[PDB]
């Protein structure tokens, strides 16, 4: 018997088998199964996640929310934006057998985040990878502004030649520009005025760059080092796929910084 | 990509052998896997004859050296025209002989980590090897998604690894062990027997011998099980024992209950065999 299902209303189920079997049979009734990924405390980061999710014609939307080791209104967030699915499980209920098998990443995962944080992007990769095999999407959405992520499950994806559709959604930022982060509602006004200076020198590098890539680092270093109290980790330029930048062509400039015990991250698209 | 039902169809490219595997599963077939790595004998056969008993069935047949789980690789063997005589003799529809560069166009990269188990027994002295094994398999069960995957018992601790990668990352695949099949006086099918001469071939039946031994002693307990084992082991010229080691069936961080495994891994010359039998304590 499949669970429960009642179309155009906000379902839960917090066991994997259960999301499981109502995904099987949705696929086989037509619809398209989209999942977006999410550790709940949905912001407006989330709603665009979502929002590219539903207007896939034929789309029933997936959202999970786990935490890797408030609900009553993520869920009605959820509702008030269409959502069909929440799939929110126990610890208990992803890791049953506790920590065994697990996804090792490529040497990427070492280099940018990896340096202050070696080992999170296994276990990134080992969530998204189960989340994809319990759910079986059509697409899987994420956002740009962990960039660094991104790139790592795109090469998930290929590298285990699975059957889903990788999206990333452009970050959505405040009216300033600060990507927006759970982490940006502690920052003191000083640092949250400090702040802009990432996506500004981002920014700033990416129209600096019809003068070549030197003349974009250099711009994007101008503006970090006006702001005081910006500890810069990197302000790195790379390809796409963040190995070494080709001579010209395209390419995604990285910073992440410090501001008092706040880490920030934000990229950008850049041309060369 | 052209799939000619009740004749072998063989495929190199991934995408290929995808795409008619799905197209099938859509038109009410099932899908069975019998992943190897070429140099098929009779035991891979019962593997695939278990595979074509599934009501439905359309059996994928994979060959395909994985170079990430290894003069060991130059030295497997490698005898693609018996195989594919073999599998169509047999009626499988889909034969899957991928090439390296189309399995690992970007080499080495996202990897599966096994857990602890991979360090054990075979694994000690091979740390990447069950890694390996577990990155290839994953792989080829997401190109082909069948519903069941098939697996001799022999090389017992592999396949519960697999078992646990399943289960660990949630794959939507029953994973079938087969029981071993055995040489007329016991010794365990294998690709590698061919490397025994005449009598490393005639002393290599201690293996069996020991283990079939030591699941009747066993009723006497646990140490007599083990200690028959090793006498059959020890009155056999030019067997040298690797271990002999009686675990729990998962072969996990679990003693000994009732129900236990026995594995034996010996040296006849240059040839490794492995052997295990179910043991059942007291019975
Ligand atoms: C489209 O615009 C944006 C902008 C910022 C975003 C997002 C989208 C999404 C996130 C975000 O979810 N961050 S998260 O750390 O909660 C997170 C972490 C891991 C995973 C993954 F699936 F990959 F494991 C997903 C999410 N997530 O919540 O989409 N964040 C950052 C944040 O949540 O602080
Ligand atoms: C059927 O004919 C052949 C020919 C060569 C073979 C094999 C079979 C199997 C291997 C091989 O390396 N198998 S193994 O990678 O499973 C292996 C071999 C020896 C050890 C040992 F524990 F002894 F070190 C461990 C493993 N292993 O399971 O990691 N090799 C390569 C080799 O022995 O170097
Ligand atoms: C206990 O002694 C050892 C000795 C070497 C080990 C290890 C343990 C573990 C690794 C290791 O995982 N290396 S690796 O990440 O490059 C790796 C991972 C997976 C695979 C495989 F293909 F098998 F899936 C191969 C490697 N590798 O070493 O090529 N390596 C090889 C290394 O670090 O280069
Ligand atoms: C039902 O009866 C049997 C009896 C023995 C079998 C099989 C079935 C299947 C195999 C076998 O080797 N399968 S396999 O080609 O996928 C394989 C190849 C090499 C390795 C190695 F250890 F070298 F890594 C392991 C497997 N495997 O079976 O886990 N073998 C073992 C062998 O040929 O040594």
Not at 200 to 221: E, M, N, P
Not at 246 to 267: C, F, H, I
């Amino acid at each position: 018997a499949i669970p429960a299902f009642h179309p155009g209303e906000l379902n839960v189920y917090s066991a994997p088998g259960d999301v499981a079997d109502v995904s099987r049979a949705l696929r086989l009734t037509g619809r398209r199964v989209m999942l977006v990924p999410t550790m709940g405390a949905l912001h407006e980061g989330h709603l665009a996640l979502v929002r590219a999710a539903k207007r896939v014609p034929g789309s029933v939307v997936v959202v999970s929310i786990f935490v890797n080791p408030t609900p009553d209104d993520d869920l009605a967030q959820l509702r008030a934006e269409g959502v069909e699915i929440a799939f929110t499980p126990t610890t208990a209920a992803m890791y049953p057998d506790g920590l065994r098998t697990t996804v090792q990443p490529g040497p990427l995962a070492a280099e940018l985040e990896g340096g202050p944080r070696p080992t999170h992007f296994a276990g990134v990769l080992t969530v998204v990878l189960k989340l994809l095999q319990i759910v079986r999407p059509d697409r899987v959405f994420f956002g740009e502004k962990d960039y660094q992520q991104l790139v790592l499950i795109r090469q998930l994806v290929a590298d285990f030649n699975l059957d889903v559709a990788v999206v990333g959604v452009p970050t959505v930022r405040e009216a300033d520009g600060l990507a927006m982060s759970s982490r940006n509602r502690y920052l003191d006004p000083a640092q949250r005025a400090a702040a802009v200076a990432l996506s500004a020198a981002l920014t700033a590098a990416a129209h600096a760059a019809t003068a070549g890539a030197q003349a974009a680092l250099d711009a994007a270093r101008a503006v970090l080092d006006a702001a005081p109290g910006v500890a810069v980790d990197y302000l790195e330029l790379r390809d796409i796929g963040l190995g070494p930048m080709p001579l010209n062509g395209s390419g995604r400039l990285l910073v992440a910084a410090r501001l008092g015990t706040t880490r920030l991250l934000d990229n950008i698209a850049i041309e060369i």
